[PDB]
Enzyme design. Structure first.
Site, PDB file in Angstrom:
ATOM      1  N   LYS A 156       0.823  -1.204   0.000  1.00 23.29           N
ATOM      2  CA  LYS A 156       0.000   0.000   0.000  1.00 23.29           C
ATOM      3  C   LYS A 156       0.856   1.252   0.000  1.00 23.29           C
ATOM      4  O   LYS A 156       0.608   2.177  -0.778  1.00 23.29           O
ATOM      5  CB  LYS A 156      -0.931   0.015   1.205  1.00 23.29           C
ATOM      6  CG  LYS A 156      -2.039  -0.981   1.153  1.00 23.29           C
ATOM      7  CD  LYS A 156      -2.982  -0.762   2.305  1.00 23.29           C
ATOM      8  CE  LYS A 156      -2.698  -1.710   3.430  1.00 23.29           C
ATOM      9  NZ  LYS A 156      -1.474  -1.396   4.196  1.00 23.29           N
ATOM     10  N   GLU A 182       0.489   5.245  11.199  1.00 22.60           N
ATOM     11  CA  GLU A 182       1.465   4.485  10.438  1.00 22.60           C
ATOM     12  C   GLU A 182       2.846   4.707  11.066  1.00 22.60           C
ATOM     13  O   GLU A 182       2.974   5.342  12.112  1.00 22.60           O
ATOM     14  CB  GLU A 182       1.366   4.879   8.957  1.00 22.60           C
ATOM     15  CG  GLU A 182       2.009   3.933   7.911  1.00 22.60           C
ATOM     16  CD  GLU A 182       1.374   2.551   7.844  1.00 22.60           C
ATOM     17  OE1 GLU A 182       0.190   2.405   8.209  1.00 22.60           O
ATOM     18  OE2 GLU A 182       2.063   1.609   7.400  1.00 22.60           O
ATOM     19  N   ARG A 183       3.875   4.123  10.461  1.00 21.08           N
ATOM     20  CA  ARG A 183       5.231   4.200  10.974  1.00 21.08           C
ATOM     21  C   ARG A 183       5.754   5.623  10.902  1.00 21.08           C
ATOM     22  O   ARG A 183       5.541   6.329   9.917  1.00 21.08           O
ATOM     23  CB  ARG A 183       6.131   3.291  10.154  1.00 21.08           C
ATOM     24  CG  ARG A 183       5.718   1.855  10.165  1.00 21.08           C
ATOM     25  CD  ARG A 183       6.608   1.070   9.257  1.00 21.08           C
ATOM     26  NE  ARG A 183       6.257  -0.335   9.265  1.00 21.08           N
ATOM     27  CZ  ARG A 183       5.407  -0.888   8.416  1.00 21.08           C
ATOM     28  NH1 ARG A 183       4.824  -0.154   7.484  1.00 21.08           N
ATOM     29  NH2 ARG A 183       5.148  -2.183   8.493  1.00 21.08           N
TER      30      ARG A 183
HETATM   31  N1  LIG Z   1       6.311  -2.695  -7.025  1.00 22.05           N
HETATM   32  C1  LIG Z   1       6.882  -3.445  -6.070  1.00 22.05           C
HETATM   33  N2  LIG Z   1       7.950  -4.207  -6.345  1.00 22.05           N
HETATM   34  C2  LIG Z   1       8.527  -4.969  -5.410  1.00 22.05           C
HETATM   35  N3  LIG Z   1       8.097  -5.037  -4.145  1.00 22.05           N
HETATM   36  C3  LIG Z   1       7.028  -4.327  -3.740  1.00 22.05           C
HETATM   37  C4  LIG Z   1       6.344  -3.469  -4.707  1.00 22.05           C
HETATM   38  N4  LIG Z   1       5.332  -2.881  -4.068  1.00 22.05           N
HETATM   39  C5  LIG Z   1       5.373  -3.325  -2.791  1.00 22.05           C
HETATM   40  N5  LIG Z   1       6.383  -4.183  -2.591  1.00 22.05           N
HETATM   41  C6  LIG Z   1       6.696  -4.856  -1.311  1.00 22.05           C
HETATM   42  O1  LIG Z   1       5.738  -4.440  -0.343  1.00 22.05           O
HETATM   43  C7  LIG Z   1       6.362  -3.956   0.843  1.00 22.05           C
HETATM   44  C8  LIG Z   1       5.783  -2.599   1.213  1.00 22.05           C
HETATM   45  O2  LIG Z   1       4.500  -2.788   1.786  1.00 22.05           O
HETATM   46  P1  LIG Z   1       3.862  -1.612   2.663  1.00 22.05           P
HETATM   47  O3  LIG Z   1       2.770  -0.960   1.866  1.00 22.05           O
HETATM   48  O4  LIG Z   1       4.999  -0.795   3.208  1.00 22.05           O
HETATM   49  O5  LIG Z   1       3.166  -2.392   3.878  1.00 22.05           O
HETATM   50  P2  LIG Z   1       1.924  -1.719   4.630  1.00 22.05           P
HETATM   51  O6  LIG Z   1       0.773  -2.022   3.712  1.00 22.05           O
HETATM   52  O7  LIG Z   1       1.874  -2.398   5.971  1.00 22.05           O
HETATM   53  O8  LIG Z   1       2.303  -0.267   4.689  1.00 22.05           O
HETATM   54  C9  LIG Z   1       7.845  -3.847   0.564  1.00 22.05           C
HETATM   55  O9  LIG Z   1       8.563  -4.651   1.498  1.00 22.05           O
HETATM   56  C10 LIG Z   1       8.053  -4.412  -0.816  1.00 22.05           C
HETATM   57  O10 LIG Z   1       8.903  -5.554  -0.721  1.00 22.05           O
END
Ligand SMILES: Nc1ncnc2c1ncn2[C@@H]1O[C@H](COP(=O)(O)OP(=O)(O)O)[C@@H](O)[C@H]1O
Ligand SMILES: Nc1ncnc2c1ncn2[C@@H]1O[C@H](COP(=O)(O)OP(=O)(O)O)[C@@H](O)[C@H]1O
Ligand SMILES: [Mg+2]
EC number: 7.1.2.2
Lengths: 472, 503, 49
Positions: A156, A182-183
């Protein structure tokens, strides 16, 4: 002006304050004195005599019983104006970037009413965000609410950073980012990214995005009022300036969850799964204020956590009800390796209509969804038996489906650290042309490995040619 | 200016009178325990001094739980609460047509005040077994699938149940957009006054809905009643009773009316909020006991009236969403149990390709062939039996169990009728073109014709029949039954068009 | 059937020899056993079996 009352009971946010002469109306901002930082409480229920049941926004530590509280007599007035661009604030209105106070002229209150039915914009221009899965299957609405559902670690935040780094360059309208629960790591990285990318400017008054952060370290009263803060900033920039604002609210389940935590302390009867009875209407007022009106435009991209990947949970369910373009950033398609793992079936958009997006885009999108639904039924049959039970029609559907499902994935600019590829910005007509060729079946000889993390379809042809040449 | 002056100074009586009140205890979250009203009657509209109504429920010896109609900031502890003196009521007229009306009577759309004449109590008792008579008129929706498998009766309630984002509101608006051709016609029995009660939605969806109805010129049947998300939980609670009271006004005057209750689960969840804030014990999924009694009142306010009671009908169709298709949840079991007609959308056919996505055998109309025209009854019963045969033979012969000529005949006719029942959004057709096209599908002439080519067959066939066969369709729709000369003529025209389709 | 990738390989080899015998050969009228061979040949060489 103010009225001095006495704290007599303390649970977190929920602080029962005794007023005997000057009891204030509901939804008020009344400060606890005797504190290091100003402890703004928010009056709700008057329950007995004297009893305003306030929700306390900050460190509840040290609240002695029988403690003097000055009632200011207004909802939470915060700074708004063009003096808040490039300037972080939290829910009281306080600047938390240590640059100085807000030097604005007027204050806008955190609590307001929705725009009425009398004046509502009904026009729908297609927002093309350079992402193949979005611009093909659930294209965005320039002036409508956009929602990024998904679990934990589904991408996300990376998709939000793509949306800023792709669309926020285009809108000259003042953007507003609201981080709720969030963080603080992500708010820090976003603040330095906005400095380095020139989106804010710490030496001039020509910055572009305002920032509000109520991150997850905050007590539940604070996190229940961050979306209101960033939303009344962006609602100033809509109404009394007339701009075409973007509103990037991550992660509105933190708002609803902070409401559930406070309500478990507020003594209300628990509703279904463990939430509050006022899940539909508190989020109702907060989402109805996020709307594009006659006076100006909001394009609001908001990330909406789902708890334990349940879309039947009440907060994601009502948030499906309150939206114009959903995108179900699933996880199982990332187990398959496709990033973002946007479930495109359960993702729709209100704007997909052949009298809007044209006949070509609609036919290509519905054909892609048809091939993937047939692939879901056939992958049930494949998972039991195997691919040696299918006919020629079924195998051509399975092969075209795996080609399409790999071709939905593209590498983003912000997620270039994880993958190896650079950021691919795919235009709209190349998305239609690529998926139209794969759907019509001109690529019954390329491997499915050649459509993974590609972008434009000429990059897929080139990846297949380079694969054949490195095998040569 | 001067007319505004004189209406302001003559309209308000300022006739002060001694009146029952009572001070306010805890004003919690839209609920207010009011001490003092020892002569208030149960479920009564009462009035907070800032100018805002509330409804008195949960009369207890301590205090009365009045639940407010709107915002909560405008109420303190200790202010008066005046009894209005009557049950909460809705102002109904035929000048209320074509105007978006906020849930009580308050037309929030910016087109002046409502010119109402007939106030009506909103919690009225539904008619009994003698004032009702059975379904007779064919309530047509313009959807081929609805009007050929689950037809509606003017006199009837029929669910639109599905999961989220399937086409249920779109089916309701196809049902609305069909009935323009009956309003602007001649017979009063055909004419339509409908009430679209949008419960708990967002204001821009209701705004774009009014845009679609105005662009389709729908605003003389239609009465849109919006109790959106920002409205209070009793405005969302009380809104479909208001639309029912307006429909009861049209019904008891003797005009065929209907009500679409869009997102009726939002009424259920708003009443859950109300009960849990008024401290009633929670039942199942935290919904209280009488949610079935709630929807049962709301949905048994509608059936055909007796010929001595005007002859007006009401068609209640409530739209309900499940979650993950779980029909076994509390609100879908209650609202399936009260209604009889119900249209089931499963969603996998929406992503598979049929539109509108009725996934079907779960859906049933108990009034059946009684609510069809005579032509559609003569054509489309063998279609339903054939689709039943097709579904069960495809279900066991998924892998090719046994393929004789009969099984490939069943799968051929089943797939071809499946592509007959596809239909685009916001394009309802009349009954006579439906009789013509299901005649071209069921009575031969399409069984060996390459199932991807059915949609172009639809387009060119409707173009043909609207091109030089308008008087014959007039004969079909006005004569009722499809006559034997019209039967062989449809046979000849579909044969000629099969030639022109393989031309 | 219900026996794996047998008939796939047989149909592949058969139509490869049919395309090789399409050029400079003409009478590629064929014989086959079993339901699965004619069932994998209702489309490409439905005349020539
Ligand atoms: N386009 C992408 N290519 C590779 N990895 C991705 C991509 N989009 C998201 N990710 C993976 O998703 C994770 C980020 O998710 P994030 O949105 O930060 O979690 P949350 O939904 O808890 O905030 C990263 O660790 C990454 O590895
Ligand atoms: N006959 C149809 N043809 C094409 N699309 C349809 C049809 N019926 C419904 N839809 C689709 O259904 C969607 C609307 O669903 P809606 O009725 O709003 O469900 P909900 O009210 O549960 O959100 C639209 O995106 C539209 O494309
Ligand atoms: Mg709906």
């Amino acid at each position: 002006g103010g009225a001095t009352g006495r704290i007599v009971a303390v649970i977190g946010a929920v602080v029962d304050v005794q007023f005997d002469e000057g009891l204030p109306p509901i939804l008020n901002a009344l400060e606890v004195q005797g504190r290091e930082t100003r402890l703004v409480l928010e009056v709700a229920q008057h329950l007995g005599e004297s009893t305003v049941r306030t929700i306390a926004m900050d460190g509840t530590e040290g609240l002695v019983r029988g403690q003097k509280v000055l009632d200011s007599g207004a909802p939470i007035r915060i700074p708004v104006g063009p003096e808040t661009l490039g300037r972080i604030m939290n829910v009281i209105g306080e600047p938390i970037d240590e640059r100085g106070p807000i030097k604005t002229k007027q204050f806008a209150a955190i609590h307001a009413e929705a725009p009425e039915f009398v004046e509502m914009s009904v026009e729908q221009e297609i927002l093309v965000t350079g992402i193949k899965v979005v611009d093909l299957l659930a294209p965005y609405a320039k002036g409508g609410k956009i929602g990024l559902f998904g679990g934990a670690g589904v991408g996300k935040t990376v998709l939000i950073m793509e949306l800023i780094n792709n669309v926020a360059k285009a809108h000259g309208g003042y953007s507003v980012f609201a981080g709720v629960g969030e963080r603080t790591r992500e708010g820090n990285d976003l603040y330095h990214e906005m400095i380095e990318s020139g989106v804010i400017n710490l030496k001039d008054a020509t910055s572009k995005v305002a920032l509000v952060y109520g991150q997850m370290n905050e007590p539940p009263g604070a996190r229940a009022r961050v979306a209101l803060t960033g939303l009344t900033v962006a609602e100033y920039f809509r109404d009394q300036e007339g701009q075409d604002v973007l509103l990037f609210i991550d992660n509105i389940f933190r708002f609803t969850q902070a409401g559930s935590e406070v309500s478990a302390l507020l003594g209300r009867i628990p509703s279904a799964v463990g939430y509050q009875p006022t899940l539909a209407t508190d989020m109702g007022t907060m989402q109805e204020r996020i709307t594009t009106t006659k006076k100006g435009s909001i394009t609001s991209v908001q990330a909406i956590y789902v708890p334990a990947d349940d879309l039947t949970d009440p907060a994601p369910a009502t948030t499906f009800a309150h939206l114009d373009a959903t995108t179900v950033l699933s996880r199982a398609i990332a187990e398959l390796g496709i990033y973002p793992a946007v479930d495109p079936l359960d993702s729709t958009s209100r704007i997909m209509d052949p009298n809007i997006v044209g006949s070509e885009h609609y036919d290509v999108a519905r054909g892609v969804q048809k091939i993937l639904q047939d692939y879901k039924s056939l992958q049930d049959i494949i998972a039991i038996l195997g691919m040696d039970e299918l006919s020629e029609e079924d195998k051509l559907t399975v092969s075209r489906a795996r080609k399409i499902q790999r071709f939905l994935s593209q590498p983003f600019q912000v997620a270039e650290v994880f993958t190896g590829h650079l950021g691919k910005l795919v235009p709209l007509k190349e998305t239609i042309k690529g998926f139209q060729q794969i759907l019509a079946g001109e690529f019954d000889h390329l491997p499915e490995q050649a459509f993974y993390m590609v972008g434009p379809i000429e990059e897929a042809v080139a990846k297949a040619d380079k694969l054949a040449e490195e095998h040569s | 200016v001067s007319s505004i002056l004189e209406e302001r100074i003559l309209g308000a009586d300022t006739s002060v009178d001694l009146e029952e009140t009572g001070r306010v205890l805890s004003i919690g979250d839209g609920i207010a325990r009011v001490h003092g009203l020892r002569n208030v009657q149960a479920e009564e509209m009462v009035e907070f001094s800032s100018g805002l109504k509330g409804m008195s429920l949960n009369l207890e010896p301590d205090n009365v739980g009045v639940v407010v109609f709107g915002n909560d900031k405008l109420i303190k502890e200790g202010d008066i609460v005046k009894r209005t003196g009557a049950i909460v009521d809705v102002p109904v007229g035929e000048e209320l047509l074509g105007r978006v009306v906020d849930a009580l009577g308050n037309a929030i759309d910016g087109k002046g005040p409502i010119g109402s004449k007939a106030r009506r109590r909103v919690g009225l008792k539904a008619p009994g077994i003698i004032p009702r008579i059975s379904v007779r008129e064919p309530m047509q929706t313009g959807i081929k699938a609805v009007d050929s498998l689950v037809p509606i009766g003017r006199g009837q309630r029929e669910l639109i149940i599905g999961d989220r984002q399937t086409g249920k509101t779109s089916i309701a608006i196809d049902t609305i957009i069909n009935q323009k051709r009956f309003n602007d016609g001649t017979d009063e029995k055909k004419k339509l006054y409908c009430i679209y009660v949008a419960i708990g939605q967002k204001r821009s969806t209701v705004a774009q809905l009014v845009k679609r109805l105005t662009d389709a010129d729908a605003m003389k049947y239609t009465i849109v009643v919006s109790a959106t998300a920002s409205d209070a939980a009793p405005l969302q609670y009380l809104a479909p009773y208001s639309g029912c009271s307006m429909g009861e006004y049209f019904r008891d005057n003797g005009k065929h009316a209907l009500i679409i209750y869009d997102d009726l689960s939002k009424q259920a969840v708003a009443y859950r909020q109300m009960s849990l804030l008024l401290r009633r014990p929670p039942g199942r999924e935290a919904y209280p006991g009488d949610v079935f009694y709630l929807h049962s009142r709301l949905l048994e306010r509608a059936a055909k009236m007796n010929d001595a009671f005007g002859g007006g009908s009401l068609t209640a169709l409530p739209v309900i969403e499940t979650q993950a298709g779980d029909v076994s949840a509390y609100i879908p079991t209650n609202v399936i149990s009260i209604t009889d007609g119900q249209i089931f959308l499963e969603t996998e056919l929406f992503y598979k390709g049929i539109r509108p996505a009725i996934n079907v055998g779960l859906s049933v109309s108990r009034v059946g062939s009684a609510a069809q025209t005579r032509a559609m009854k003569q054509v489309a019963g063998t279609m339903k039996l054939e689709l039943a045969q097709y579904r069960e033979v495809a279900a066991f012969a998924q892998f090719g169990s046994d393929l004789d000529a009969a099984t490939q005949q069943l799968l051929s006719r089943g797939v071809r009728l499946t592509e007959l029942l596809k239909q685009g959004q916001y394009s309802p057709m009349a009954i006579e073109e439906q009789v013509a096209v299901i005649y071209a599908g069921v009575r031969g002439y399409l069984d060996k014709l390459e199932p991807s080519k059915i949609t172009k067959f639809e387009n060119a066939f409707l173009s043909h029949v609207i091109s030089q066969h308008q008087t014959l369709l007039g004969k079909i729709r006005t004569d009722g039954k499809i006559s034997e000369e019209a039967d062989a003529k449809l046979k000849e025209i579909v044969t000629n068009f099969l030639a022109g389709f393989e031309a | 059937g219900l026996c794996g990738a047998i008939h796939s390989s047989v149909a592949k080899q058969m139509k490869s020899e049919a395309a090789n015998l399409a050029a400079a050969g003409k009478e590629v009228k064929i014989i086959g056993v079993g339901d699965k061979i004619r069932s994998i040949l209702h489309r490409t060489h439905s005349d020539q079996f």
